[PDB]
Every structure is written in C-alpha cells, then in structure tokens.
Amino acid sequence: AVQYFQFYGYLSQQQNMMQDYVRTGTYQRAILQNHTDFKDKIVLDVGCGSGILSFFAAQAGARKIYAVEASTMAQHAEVLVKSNNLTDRIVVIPGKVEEVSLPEQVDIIISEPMGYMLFNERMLESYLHAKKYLKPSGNMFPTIGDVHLAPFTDEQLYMEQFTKANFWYQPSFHGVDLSALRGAAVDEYFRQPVVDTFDIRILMAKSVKYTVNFLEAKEGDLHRIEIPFKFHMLHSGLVHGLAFWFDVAFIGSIMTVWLSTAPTEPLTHWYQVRCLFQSPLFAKAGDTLSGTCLLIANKRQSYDISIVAQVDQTGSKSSNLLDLKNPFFRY
Amino acid sequence: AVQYFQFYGYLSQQQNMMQDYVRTGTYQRAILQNHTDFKDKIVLDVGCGSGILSFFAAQAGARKIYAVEASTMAQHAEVLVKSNNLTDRIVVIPGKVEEVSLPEQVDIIISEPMGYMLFNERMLESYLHAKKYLKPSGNMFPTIGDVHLAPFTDEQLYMEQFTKANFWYQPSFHGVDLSALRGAAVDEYFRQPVVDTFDIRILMAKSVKYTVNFLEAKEGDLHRIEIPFKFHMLHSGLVHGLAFWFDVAFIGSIMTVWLSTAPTEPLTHWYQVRCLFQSPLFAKAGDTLSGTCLLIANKRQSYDISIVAQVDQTGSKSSNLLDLKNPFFRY
Numbered sequence A, B: 001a002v003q004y005f006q007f008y009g010y011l012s013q014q015q016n017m018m019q020d021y022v023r024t025g026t027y028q029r030a031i032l033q034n035h036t037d038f039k040d041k042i043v044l045d046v047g048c049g050s051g052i053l054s055f056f057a058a059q060a061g062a063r064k065i066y067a068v069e070a071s072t073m074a075q076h077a078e079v080l081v082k083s084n085n086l087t088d089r090i091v092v093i094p095g096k097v098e099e100v101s102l103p104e105q106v107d108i109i110i111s112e113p114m115g116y117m118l119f120n121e122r123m124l125e126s127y128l129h130a131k132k133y134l135k136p137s138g139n140m141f142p143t144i145g146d147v148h149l150a151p152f153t154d155e156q157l158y159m160e161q162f163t164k165a166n167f168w169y170q171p172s173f174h175g176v177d178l179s180a181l182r183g184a185a186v187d188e189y190f191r192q193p194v195v196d197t198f199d200i201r202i203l204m205a206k207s208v209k210y211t212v213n214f215l216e217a218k219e220g221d222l223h224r225i226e227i228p229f230k231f232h233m234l235h236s237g238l239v240h241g242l243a244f245w246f247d248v249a250f251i252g253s254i255m256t257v258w259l260s261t262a263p264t265e266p267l268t269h270w271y272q273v274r275c276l277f278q279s280p281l282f283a284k285a286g287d288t289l290s291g292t293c294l295l296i297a298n299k300r301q302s303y304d305i306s307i308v309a310q311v312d313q314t315g316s317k318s319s320n321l322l323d324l325k326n327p328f329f330r331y
C-alpha cells in the first residue's frame, strides 16, 4: 500500500499516463461536450493525480472542484493549481477519499479508476465509496463500465509458454538436473495474464458483456464478480483462452461519450488482456463454449481470476486460476 | 517484505539469474577449485533460491548442506534435492535465516547477497547475521567485497534527463500549462541511479575502493557506509557524476576466485550504476575531485545515496541525494 502511493507519486508515471492520447482526449471531450453538467456545479475529483480532470471541470465552468489524491502527487497538483491561477476554484485535499473531510456534497464525481480488465488495482472501490459525497441528483463520470470476454485461438502464444519453460529441461545445468521443475515453470507462465494487443481475426465468437453501473453499484459488489458465458463458435479450431477488454460510458445531459480499449479501437495503455487455459479446447463452428469467469478480490489490492469453459457438444473442458498481480507485458 | 519474497518466489526470476553465465560459472569455479574446503564439511546456504550453490557444495563432497530460503522458492529447491537424489545431504529449511533452527554449527557459509552497487536489497545483513552458525575456523564464500567509485563524463546521459522532463514545458496541454512542474520532473529523473554498462573511456580518474570483509564485519556496519574519495583527474572536461561497480573474492585454501562486475569485464546482470550530479563540474587533468559518498539504510530494504564532490583547485561543488529503490534501467 506504501508501494502503490509511492509508484503513483512519480511525475514520470503521470507523464506516461497523460501521453495516452485516447485516454486524455476522450475525458476532455466527455467533460466539455457535457459542459452544462459542470457549469457552476460542485465536483469531486477522486485520485486526481496531477489534477488534469479538475482543470477540465474548470474549463467547463465548475464553481468548486475538490481534488483528492492519497500520494505525494497531491503537492504537485497544488503547484499546477497555483500556476494556472485557480486556487479559488480547485482545492487539493491530500489523503485517501475514505479518510478526508469535504465541507459540502457534490453534483458530480469524476475519476479514472480503470485498471487492466477494468477491475485491476481496485481503485473502483474508492470511486464507489466517494458516492457518500454525491447529492441524489448527482452524476458519475464515468457512469457505467462494460467488460467484454471472447474466446481466442493463438497457437504462437500458447507454444511461447512451453518454449520459455524448456530452460528447465537441462539434465546437466552445471551438473544439476533441472527437469523435475519444467512442469512447475509451465504452470507459472500459464498463471500470468498476457497484456498486449492482437488482431480481432483471432476471436472465435462474438464477445459477451458484464456491465457495472457505477451510479447504483456498492463497494461490496466487487469482492466477488461472476461472469457466466455461452459463446456461439463462429470458427473451427483450438480455443487457447479468453480475451478481455472494457468500455466506459460518460452519460451526460447533452451526450454519451465512450472510452473503448477494444481491439477494433485505437490502442490505449490498457492494451487488452488474455488468460490462457492449461489445455486448449477443440470447437467446431456451431458448437457452444459455456462456463464462468470469476474474479475474487484478494488482500493484495488485486484479483484471483478463475476461468472454466466446456464445449457443450463434446464435454471437452479446461480451466485456469490466474493472478492479475503478475501480468506478462508482451507488447 | 511480502512483495520481496513473492518476487523471488518465481521460477522465471531464478531462470533469469541462472542465465547470468559469469555469475553461475564463477560460483561453480570458486567452490570446485576449492573443493578440499568443502570435502566432508558442514555448509550453510543462505537465501539458496533454487539450491544451485547447495548442489555445487555437494559436487565438492560436503557431508551436510543446510539450504535456507524465506520465499516459496524453498518448496521448488526441495523438489530438485529429491530429484537429484541428495535428501541425506541437502536439507532445505523454509524461513528467514534470522528465525530458523540449525542443529549444528557449520564450517562454511555460501551465499549470493550482492545487489546493484553491492549493498542494494540488504540481503548482506542476512549473510552477516548467519555467522552466528559459523565455527571460529569457518570461511565465508564470498569472503570480501570491494565497491569501486570513479568520476565520469557523459553529456548524452546528462542531457537525456532534460529531454525526458521537457514534456512538462507545454503551456497548453489540453488548455493546461504544465511548465511550473518542469523543474520537479528534472529533479526526479536526476534522483534515479542509472543501471547500464558504458565504455571505460568515459572514466576521468582511476577508481577508489571501499572494502567490506564479510568474515569480520557485523550487521550494524551497513546502516551507514561512508566512502570518502580523492580523485586525481586524468582528463579535462565536465564530470557529470560517479560510476559504481563491485568485485567479490572467494578466498579458499587452494585459490582466490574473483567475481567482477567492472566495465572492463564481461557483462553481468548487475551491469554498472551511475549517479548524476544536479550540475556538472569542470575539472582539468591534474586537478583533484574530493568529497564523500554516503549510503544510509532506510526502512524500505534500500539506501539513500548522498554524493558530495568539489574540484579542490576551483571550489566548484555539486551534490545529489539519490534513491536506490527507483533505479532507471537504461540497458
């Protein structure tokens, strides 16, 4: 937890995030095409970092913006507020949104709480917690989140996991036989979600959607997330795992603006995420691939991912337990 | 601390370390050219990881080897001990060397406790702590450590720090003026030690040495390490900072074997480390560059690095406080 706020304390991290053109431009467009929703309103900016969303709120005419930031990035936001001549309008409050005091309720909460697969980092729990400060007529920006799942075929990725583990086949590494660890090494590679982009041609079925409505949802809804799926296979081949991406919608008065990290859309720094099965499933076009993705929040600010899939027509089944805290960055 | 043992729990980390050819080959050569020092002896392997050094001890004829490992890598070492038919000779003890019980004192302690700049990670403190289990005739492998410091000239590295920070000059980043943060960003880049290799031609003076004798030294000797230096400048130019590397010596009966991470030597995964000054010093050939490097152990398993240097002939002086827990990996 002291490791999490240190890492977000670095101007190099804020720079890397601000250089995501889709992320920065989409938030500006969401807030400013919906400027009447901000005009003379009160705004809470949760995990504000450098404060850019507070500035966007100010561009839209907000009367008062409370910018809450738990890391030492708070003192840098304060410097930009003074230097952009907005001390009367933007108030930086150093601390966790759970532990700080605001003097008044707000019309609108803005935030960027999305991790890889949306739920990673569980700053979503802090976004929902912040609703205690929201007037009952109030909005949230973003408003809803959709996670997309789809089965994929990628024998290169699958085989790459075996190739990495084949170091451990050496029967004489300096007179030591490593081979009894090859299986454990394979296992550990397969437990890593793969973060990179891929061509949509590798998807074998249309995605299924799981929606979180941030206006209605509560902190506890996210300890255990259950995503049942029935896929109508559009292609015949080995299914090597499930691909994940997410969309969030900023639902204003004037306009609904979407931020999409789909593989059909321009690349973002969220990329997309793939979880391999231990063992691939053969499916023909016309078969159904059914099962559950389960996300269980662990006391390490992340999620255990359980995936179970079965081809209904053959009963060929495959699973994996993956660890969203040890991603493999293949990009 | 739960983050440190998790990270060393991964077979991919053990593989990456074993693929350091100089590291693996030098340890095998040290232990096996000095096999009479192991023949029928008792051995403590501190932070054994996968157990390779215990296997080297066994190749040399050791009677009993206690392999202590605090991470879940312990259960993988146990698998290799069973599969290499050595359960009578190698005993894996899961836990910290500080908290576990050995039934007998040992003739020799072996370990790989060197971090970047030698002291990084402070597993050296665990190596010295282990001496409570060492017979008074006992040896330590490795036996001594030398840290080397030398001044360097590298205007490309120096200027690269400004180039990175120039993102923050933008007077209209989406209608926000970032420029008041440019200085803080420069500052933060200069506080990162640079981990990569370089051509010896960039060194401006012969290195100075600071020796740790692991046989004599005690845990507390490493809370505060003071490295005074007087450099006789061999070249005329800007001195942009200090370069660091280290050598350890395995001093056996038969042979002293050196593991060197010097820039004249074959590359290792320790690379070398450079700390920039805020401001470079002009020195002519014949001048003396004098000052102190100070390492202060912080409660984050790392060191605050203080560097002060002055050209005696001009009194031009320069400093930096660097953070060995936020290295920049430039390689």
Ligand SMILES: N=C(NCCCN(CCNC(=O)NCc1ccccc1)C[C@H]1O[C@@H](n2cnc3c(N)ncnc32)[C@H](O)[C@@H]1O)NC1CCCC1
Pocket: A004, A005, A008, A009, A014, A017, A018, A020, A023, A024, A027, A046, A047, A048, A049, A050, A051, A052, A053, A068, A069, A070, A071, A073, A095, A096, A097, A098, A112, A113, A114, A115, A121, A123, A126, A268, A269, A270
């Ligand atoms: N996006 C992520 N991760 C999401 C979380 C980051 N988050 C948002 C960064 N705020 C940001 O850039 N804002 C400006 C911006 C936003 C959008 C567009 C342009 C500019 C983390 C931030 O919340 C803070 N925090 C965590 N828990 C708490 C708490 N309890 N209370 C208060 N603050 C808390 C943290 O210290 C930190 O400042 N990763 C990368 C993938 C690609 C894009 C970037």
Ligand SMILES: N=C(NCCCN(CCNC(=O)NCc1ccccc1)C[C@H]1O[C@@H](n2cnc3c(N)ncnc32)[C@H](O)[C@@H]1O)NC1CCCC1
Pocket: B004, B005, B008, B009, B014, B017, B018, B020, B023, B024, B027, B046, B047, B048, B049, B050, B051, B052, B053, B068, B069, B070, B071, B073, B095, B096, B097, B098, B112, B113, B114, B115, B121, B123, B126, B268, B269, B270
């Ligand atoms: N070398 C490092 N870092 C140094 C520390 C690593 N260290 C040695 C890895 N042991 C290793 O590879 N051995 C085999 C080997 C050795 C040499 C040659 C071939 C094979 C960390 C290990 O000690 C453990 N630990 C930490 N604190 C404690 C404790 N209190 N008690 C007990 N164990 C503790 C940890 O969990 C872990 O298993 N980094 C890279 C730079 C280039 C080379 C690799």
Ligand SMILES: [Ca+2]
Pocket: A055, A056, A058, A059, A084, B175, B176
């Ligand atoms: Ca503005």
Ligand SMILES: [Ca+2]
Pocket: A172, A173, A174, A175
């Ligand atoms: Ca060999």
Ligand SMILES: [Ca+2]
Pocket: A175, A176, B055, B056, B058, B059, B084
């Ligand atoms: Ca052996």
Ligand SMILES: [Ca+2]
Pocket: B172, B173, B174, B175
């Ligand atoms: Ca712009």
